[model samples]
Structures are given as C-alpha cells and as structure tokens.
Target: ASLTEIEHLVQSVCKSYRETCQLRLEDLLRQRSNIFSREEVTGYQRKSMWEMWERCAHHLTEAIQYVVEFAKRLSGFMELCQNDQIVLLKAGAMEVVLVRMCRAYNADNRTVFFEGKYGGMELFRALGCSELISSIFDFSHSLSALHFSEDEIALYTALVLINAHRPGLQEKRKVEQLQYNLELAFHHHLCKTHRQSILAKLPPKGKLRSLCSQHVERLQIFQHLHPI
Candidate 1:
C-alpha cells in the first residue's frame, strides 16, 4: 500500500475504535445509573440482609456486564488469540471496574458516589480500607484534573486493555505491534507540542499494571469477607 493508503487505514481504524468506545461509555453510564439508584442503596442500607444483598448484586451484575461489553468493544481484543483474550480480560477486568466506578466519584468531596449516597472517606475507613479509599480518591482527582476528552479516555482504555507482556501470550510481538499502533494513533490525535507533556504524565505500563493488580488483590480480599 502507498503512504496515503496506510495513513488513511490508520486513521480509519482509530476513528472506528474511538466511536465504538464512546458508545460503550454511554451505555455503561446508563447501566450504572440503572443498577445503583441512590435512594435504593440508602433504603437498603437501613434495612435487612436481603436488601443489602440486593444492592450488592446490582453493582456486581452491572460490573460483569459492563466489563464483558467493554472488552468486546476494544478494537483489537477479539483479534488476539483466544487464550490471550482470556488472559487480558482476567488481568484487566478489575482495573476497568475501578476506573468505571470512579466515574461517579466526587473528587472535591473525596467521596465515591457510585449511584448511591453510600460513600465518603469515613465509610471507606470504617470498612477498613482507608488506603484504598484514599488512593482511589487521589487517582480520581488527578484524572479529573487532566480533563481527558472522551476520545482520550477511550484511547487510554485501549492502552490499558492491550498489554502485550501479560503471561501466557502466544503472539506477543503481534500484540505489541497493535499496542504501538494504538499509541501512535493516540499521539497523532494530539498536537505535537502537547503530546510529550501528556505522555509524560501517564502512568508507565508496568506501574499501571501493578496498580491494577493491587486493586484486584484488594477486591479479592474484600469480596472474600463480604462475599459480594
């Protein structure tokens, strides 16, 4: 293919990827709101075990549904080897959950208002997760400060999902090439002068991976105790 054709191909792929992700984001927002109504959670919190379970079930149900759809919507996810697809989904699901839940956080109040009036730092610590609560608040605040556009969020989400170095990968090089293409497209969408600055602020791949693992670990422990 000629240079023009290749450039057009890249842009076309990136455009399709971004638009799909935006639609996924909108659908996810609607799902979140529908699953976790503020008054329902508040009322359930005041009531019985069944009510509590009902509330928890709603969040977990939407989380699983959203994760499945989000991963499916990623540009290259299905193109990966089937084994690699499972590995990536396993590795990335919690990170995606954490990021999606934080969309409801009020950074100014350091509260996690995820479709409920059921959050504040005090409640977080009361549940014995002061550090998790604090880190999430801080992360959400910093992310909000960056004022990422929907396209940027989609790009970042793609970057988070397409890690080539995850264990059990059969076609690591091909996966890495896909990551490179996504990164290039993201940079191309930004102005040259601002590109370096934004890139510098982004978490390194290893660090992001590590943070995702930590949150997943915390989630596991929390779930084991609460059985959510």
Candidate 2:
C-alpha cells in the first residue's frame, strides 16, 4: 500500500481506539458508584447517634468529593491526551488497565468495605470529612468553606430539634472523640480559619431524628455519605 493508504488506516484505527478507551473509562466511573446500595442509611439506631447531623455530615462530604474529584480527574486526563503525544492505541491499552485497577482497588473495596459494620459507610464518611476540611482549611481556596449552605444549615437545625435531650457523659465523650477527628479533617487550614461551628452545631441525640426528618430530601446525601 502507498503511504497515503497507511495513513488512512492509522487514522481509522486511532478513532476506534479512542472510542474503546472512552468506553472503558466510562465503565470504571460507573463501577466506582455501582458497588453499594444507594439506599439512605438512617434507620439504624446507634446508641450515640445525634440528630445534629453528626454522622450525616461526613457522608455528604464523601459523596460531594467523589463527584467533584471524578470530574477533575476526567478533565486532567482529557487535557493530557489533548496536549501530549498519547498514541491512541497506547491510550486504549492503558484505559483497559485503569478499568481493571478501579475494579480491583476501588470497586472491590467499595463493596467489601461498605458491607462490614463500618465499611464504606464509615470510610467514605471520613473521606468526605477530609475533603470538607481541605476546602475550609486549604487557604488557597481549592475547596468550599463550611458556611453551612442553606440546605445544610436547615437540615442541621432540624436534627438539633429532633434530638433535644442530652445523652450521658459517656456518649458525649465518644462524640467528642468523633468531633476531634472531624476537626483534624480540616487542620490543613490555619487555626484562625478554623470554624468552631462545625462541631458546635450538633444537638444531642434525642432531638436529632425529628430535625433530620424535617428535610427528608437531603437524605440523598445519607446514602453516599462518608463512603469508603
């Protein structure tokens, strides 16, 4: 075949390869989200559960971060392919590996972790806390501040009303430990920037249920909250 014929073949193959790569990447993204039941997890009655969004806050943070970071990574990869000489064939091959990696590391972990008493449910919540803290504390302003968005503030307020009664000192102490970790979640930011309201907003356990039920739609955050 002439050089022109070879060039045409190359272009066609490249196009096919890119399409395959895109499909693989899409699968990876889907697997990350598909591992666990998205059902809202509010029915459980933990001894120390507080109405003030004590646990829900962590879950919301994780879901938001997963959404945001996934977007950013996709953007970064697209940009790299645009500028760099990423051979379409090689890219396709790499994408297959990526799909496998996601399935193995994240997808598998997502399932295994969530099934345990405190699997994805707790890990993702903590992950969300990390993102929240980064946004509030990262002086560069990469993430959002914890001004308690209207919905968040409203939801939190409702929790307080639902669980108005104070728990025993032991319960409160355990809560204090949880809050301390939450506070660390944002420590990357300077001390002056740290807001006390993050912890202070939580009401005791008795008042929280009614507060959470008041704005039920926000319960979507409950499913993906603090995911693994």
Candidate 3:
C-alpha cells in the first residue's frame, strides 16, 4: 500500500477526530512522507525512510535470530532435518522481529497513547516490557541509515512475497501479522499510519520492479556472503 493511504487512515482512525492531531502528524510529514511513489517507494523507503524502514529491516533480522536460538534449544524434540530446522529458525526469527515490531509500535506513543495515558496504560502496565520496548526503538534507530545486508534483504523480501501469495497464517493471524507489519512500518517513521494504501493501488509490474530495486543493491552487496 502507498504511504498516502496510510496517512489518511491514521487521520481518520488514530483517534476520535478531536485527538487525531495530537500524534505529531506534522513531524512525520516533514521527515518521511515522500517514500510512497509507485515506481520508487521501496527504494526511497530503504534508503531514507529512517524510522519506518528501520522497523522493517530490523524485524527480519530479529526474526532470523529467534529461529536460530529456538532450533538450538529444541534440537532434541524432533528429527530436525536441515530444512525443518530452517523453518523453525525462520519462524522463531520472525517472532522476535514481530515482537520487536510490537514494541516499537507501542513506544511510538501514538497508536494507543491516549488510551494508555488515560487508563489503559495501567492495564498493560502489569505486563511491563518497557525496557525491551526502549531497546527495540534504540536498535531500530541506530540502524536507520544502514541498508540490509544483501542476504538478509533477500530472505525477508522472499518471505513477504510468499506470505502475499499463499499466506501461511490463519485469517485472524493474517490480519494480526499485517497489523504487526503495518505497525513496524509506521514505527520506523515511514508513513503517517500503518502500511500505505498506495502500495495496494500501484500497478503490479511497476511495484515489483520498485520493491526489487529497493533491496537488490544491498543484497548484491551481501552477495559475496552467500550460503555455500
């Protein structure tokens, strides 16, 4: 989806109309609004979208990390063939990334800010993960200027496409996954709302080229590190 649609959605749905403007739309607009172009949005996003793109790139990295760790600990549970191991690893990795994405979204203090500030904060407060939250945001910010290593870029681009085709998630989880993905995108500071609607409206041919071009350079950079 295009960032523009997400922008409009945020304004319409972020809060009651009265509270929508409280989320610093102006700040985001000035810093990261132009990355929604049909032919170049992804590239623009990878290079300069800062907060939002970092959110995207980092989640995949974290997700990969989780998969590896989980596979190590559960090695005795099953046959654990390399392919099976890879699936477990990839899933775990994505989990960490997804959780991190959640943290970033919550930290933005925009999504559920009013609710948290007023009363809801106390509710989720008991589940305190604020430190983890800060850390995720910090990690995402630090890597804001860096592109994904080529290998990592290829891995996630493939995952996103696979999901787009035959979504591996249940309907509800699919929505949640999309929600998480959208929030991660927003958390990175790329768009005003969640996933931009413009992305959905773009002509597929141009869009594919746009997204591929976005990560190809970085992946090519990491090409030398390819698995043997």
Candidate 4:
C-alpha cells in the first residue's frame, strides 16, 4: 500500500525472527554438555514412547505460537482478505517455522536447543521416526551453514509467507503481486548487501510434504496406542 511497507516488513521480520530464537541460545556456547550417555537426550527411557511424542508435540506447539504472532504483525498480511490470511498461515506457517528453526539449530554440535536443553539426533530416537528426524536435521544443517544475516533471513521469511502458489487462495492475483514485491526487495538487498541463493539448499517441497505427513501418521498411531 505504501513504499514504507518493505521497510516495515523487514523491521518486523528481523525482530520477530530474533525473538523466535531469543531464549534458545542466549548464552555464548553450551558447556561441554557431554560426559553423559543415555542422559544426553532430555527424554530418557523414563517415559513411554507415546509420552515422549506428546512432549515433542508440546514443544512444537510453543514454537508455532511465535510464527502465528509474527504472521499478524507482518506487513500487508492482514490485507489479504481474512480467509486468505487463514489459508496462508495454515499452508505456510510450518515451512516458516522450520526455516526459523534453522537459526536456533546448533550446526556445530548437530543439536537443536529447546525447552532449555540441547538434544541431537539420538534425542529423537524414541519416536521411531528416525528418517524424519534426520531429514529435518539435514535441512536445518544446510540452511544454517549459510550463516544468513538477520536482514537476509527477514527477506527470506517474507518471501516464504507471500508465496504465490499456496493452495486455496481467494485472490491469487493479490498474492502474486505481494510476492513480487518481496522478491524485488530481496533482489536489491541480497545482491547489493549480502547474499545466499537459499533455493539451492531448501528442502524439496515434495520431500518436506511427505515427511510431515508421515510424521503426522506416526503421531496418530501413538495416540491410538496410548488411548486416554
């Protein structure tokens, strides 16, 4: 609606991404959180498999809240007709959270810091979803390696939200127009300031879709197993 939109967009995105990752890694580096074997993973064998699955679900719920908060604060997001707004978040929020999750990833240690503790691949073994856990780690690892700047990640995030092809759009044209601006902003910022052709390293849409779906089925199965 105004030239200032891009600036405001960038401003909000940077702060939001920072806030999303705020407490996860505030300290410089984790102390050698090694020296423990089975205890390394925050979830020990103390809980049944389904309980651990529920715990991860709880943690994921908290992470998604940050995405929803940022979604409304994002520039031009509300102008997209209320239905489209819902569609965008429903379709795009998980992808954005996964990207934002990149910033919190401890690429060096191959760990994800969450719930005030560090956990690696083995931490997720209880889920019987080994392939999915490792695939997510691979995605995080690749994206994190670029060491994208706050501004760049902001622009990247903006594009992820404005993605034109998201399913069930009320006004695809408006979404397309919005995506163009984000792309233009990224073009000027990335080449002129700093750069990373993030597309090269992004997880393939099909695989991410399949992985998420597969993970969902596993959760459903566990719920059936645990029956309250």
Candidate 5:
C-alpha cells in the first residue's frame, strides 16, 4: 500500500503523457488516414452533419488508444485478469477521456481545444447535439473553475478508472483496494492543498456518467446515420 506507487502511476500514465505531445485534430486529417476535415465540415451545412460527425467520431475513437496506453502502465491494472482489464477500459475509458478533455478546454471563450483547433459551441452546431456539446462545455467550465492542477487531474483520472463496483469486474476487492489507496492519497493531497473552499463549486463526479452515456448515445446515432 505504498502511496508512491499511486503517484508514480498518475505521473507516468496520466501527467507525463498529457504534457508530452498532445495530438492535433487537423493533423489527423493531413495524414490522409481520415476522411473528413474542417473545410469540408464548414463548406456544406447538411442538415444531419453526419459527415462532420464522422470526423468527430474519428477523433474520439483515436483518443481511446492514448487512454488505453495509460491503463497498461497503471500500477496493478496490468495484473488484473484480462477480462477485468477490458471491463474496466470498456466502462471507464470515455469518462476519463471526458476528464482529460478539460485540460484542452478554454473557459474564457467557452471552447474545447481539440484537433489543434479551438472549437466553440457554434462550430459544432451542425452535429445536431447542441445539448450534449453545451453540457460538456458546462462541465469543463465548472471543472476548470475549480482550477485543478495537473497533479490533481492525474490522481482524479486514476480514481475514475479504479471504480470498485463496475459491473463484471471479477476482482471487486482488488479494484477497491486500488481505489482506496488512490482516494487516501488524493484526499491527503487535497488537504495539503486546502481545496476545501472550492470543493463546493465543483461538479459532482456523477456528472460524467450521464455525460458519457449521452456521448455514447450520439456516437451510435452518428454511426447509424453514416456507416463506415
């Protein structure tokens, strides 16, 4: 139960990777590996925006690999049964992705920084998921308002992935132990940092569950509207 392990995992898996080389949305298009681009997205305003959504879909899908990379290096995560690992990733990945997105958010303009392009609500209008987009910006805005440090975000990401009760987790006790260690360290950090004043302004962690659900719902809708 070494706290050092928790910090190391957070720094290596979450913090370092984040600071090193953030990916670019426009860069992905330039590689010619993807089908859509900003020009195409803006050139035509199809009612569905499904084509643009394709690029959006592409971006989210690609983001998952980096999340997965973090999981592999996560202390104790690798030792879990592969099934449990998959279960954890399947359920927890996108939520963490949402959490990471906050780092790329621009609270002043209410825009998300992805694709190396700053995207505001208006830019995403055609995607026809204004409510979801607005909710994300709102979540980012509030979370940003809390002013989490990279260290805090790293620990929180670990906390999000170490859910003890995720359905189908074969080793619930094992997972909870990891989470307990994480929470202890995180709380210790919070106390040291004296974040008690701003805790009241923070959005509930429960927010990500519903936000993720809506994201999945819309991603599915996008796929339905435009397959492959």
Candidate 6:
C-alpha cells in the first residue's frame, strides 16, 4: 500500500525544512567571501587559479558547519554518546561535505561554483591533482544525473554520518543499527518513488567509502602543496 496522506505531508514538511537549511548554508558561503575582500577581475587578465582554492577552503568550512548542524538535528545522532558523536563526525565529515558539494557541481561545464566563483577541473589539475581528484569529479557527475529528492539527500547525509566502524567508537552496535535503519529508510523512499533505475545506479558503498578516504587524503596533499 502507498504511504498515507499524513505520512506524505510529514515527508513534505521535512523536505521543505531541509531545503531551507541548505539554502541558508549556501548563503553563508557568499557572505564569507565578502568578509575577506571585494573580488574583482582586472582588465585583460584572468583571476588567479589559486584564488579558487581559497574559496574552496571557505566553502568547505561551511559544508562542515552544515554537517554538524545536520547531525545535531538528527534524532538518531542526538541519541548517541558524546564520544561516539565526535567519532562519527570526525570520520564522516569529509564524505558529507563532498556529497553536499556535489549538488553544486556542473558536470556539463566541468566546473563547480563556490560562493560566487567558479573552479574548473583544469585549475585542480594545475595544482597537482591526480586520479583521486578525477574519480571524485566523475562520481559527482554521475550523482548529479540522479537528481535526488530532498528526502533522499537528507537520508544520505544521515547514512554517511552514522558509520559503525569508525575507530574508537564506544557504541559500535548502536551506530550500526542507526546506519542500517537509515539505509532501509532510504531504500523505502526510493521504492516509494519507483526509481528502479536510480536504485541500480546508486554508487557502491565500497567505492564511495574509499572515495571519502581519498577525498580527505587528497585534500591534505592539496593544502600542503599549495600553502596559503
């Protein structure tokens, strides 16, 4: 049987609230860019590619903030122990940020806009990005094609943040149960929408998990390779 009207309304309200939070977080990034300085491009000259990294840093920080707020709002997360909470965030923050940022990626243009500036793959390559970076872009491009709903996005965010195997976890079983429930919920949501094509196309957990690790590793390398 289909979900009841009240159940559908609940989903709609949650989706709208999450969407509103996402828009506000995006605005935070824009406001930050102004705090540094008014950006302008000089005549007959293009903006420095390095500037894009600075913008990335600012936006990534905002992404992390969104993740933290998201975790705080999740009932499952709130029920976890403080130490477990910290462990999950530390292990999953990069993945959540990457996933969130992917929504803004432009696969057609091969560029991602942060705040008000655009950064292309070419710029990333010039800064010494390698295969790992390309894999991220490719994954994000594929993800963009799915066009997930707000409920799906929210579920995925929770799924990422409730990892059971994170090192130093005090309540591994609890975390696992939460993640399992989240995955089941996500599956049910997709089933309800009859998105069999997307269900098949969703990225594998193994690769996505590896990508998250590599994303964090590559982020550090990029930072060190291009100091300030």
Q: Can you tell me which runs of candidate 6 are displaced by over 4 Å?
A: 1-21, 24-52, 117-119, 130-132, 222-228
> All models: lDDT?
0.60, 0.31, 0.34, 0.71, 0.72, 0.66
lDDT for residue 86 in candidate 4, whole number 0-100:
86
Clashing pairs in 1: none
Where is model 5 more than 4 Å wrong at Cα?
2-48, 194-200
Q: Against the hidden true structure, what lDDT does model 4 obtain?
A: 0.71
How well is each residue in 1-228 modelled by candidate 4, as lDDT tens digits?
455776665566667666665343335245326323556554454556777777877777776787877777766677799889888888777777777777667787787765555667777677777787897887888788777766777778778888779889989999898888777667666666646465465556776676557656775777787753
Which candidate order results from sorting by TM-score in descending order? 4, 5, 6, 1, 3, 2
Pairs in clash, predicted candidate 5: 25-115
Ranking by lDDT: 5, 4, 6, 1, 3, 2
**How far out, in Å, is residue 10 in model 3?**
40
Residue range with the least summed lDDT across 10 consecutive positions in model 2: 135-144
- Global Cα RMSD, each model: 5.1, 22.6, 18.5, 3.1, 5.4, 5.9
The runs of at least 3 residues in candidate 4 whose Cα sits more than 4 Å from the true structure, single-residue gaps closed, are 1-5, 19-38, 42-46, 196-207, 226-228
Largest TM-score belongs to which candidate?
A: 4
| Candidate 2, 1-228: lDDT as tens digits | 344543443333233334332224434445555444334333332323233255555544453333223322321123322212123212222222222122223423433212223224333343233343222222212111333322232222222211212332223443343333323322322233354555554333333233223223344453445222
lDDT of 6 at 102: 64
Candidate scoring better on TM-score of 2 and 3: 3
Best by lDDT: 5
Residue 34 C-alpha lDDT in model 3:
25
Better of 2 and 4 by lDDT: 4
What is the C-alpha lDDT profile of model 3 across 1-228, one tens digit per residue? 566754543333222212311234334334332222343333322443234334434544544554344334321213333444344333333333332232223323322222122111222222223343343344444333233322222223223322322323334344344445434433433233242433343233443333334434543433443321
- Superposition TM-score, candidate 3 onto the true structure: 0.24
Candidate with the larger lDDT of 3 and 5:
5
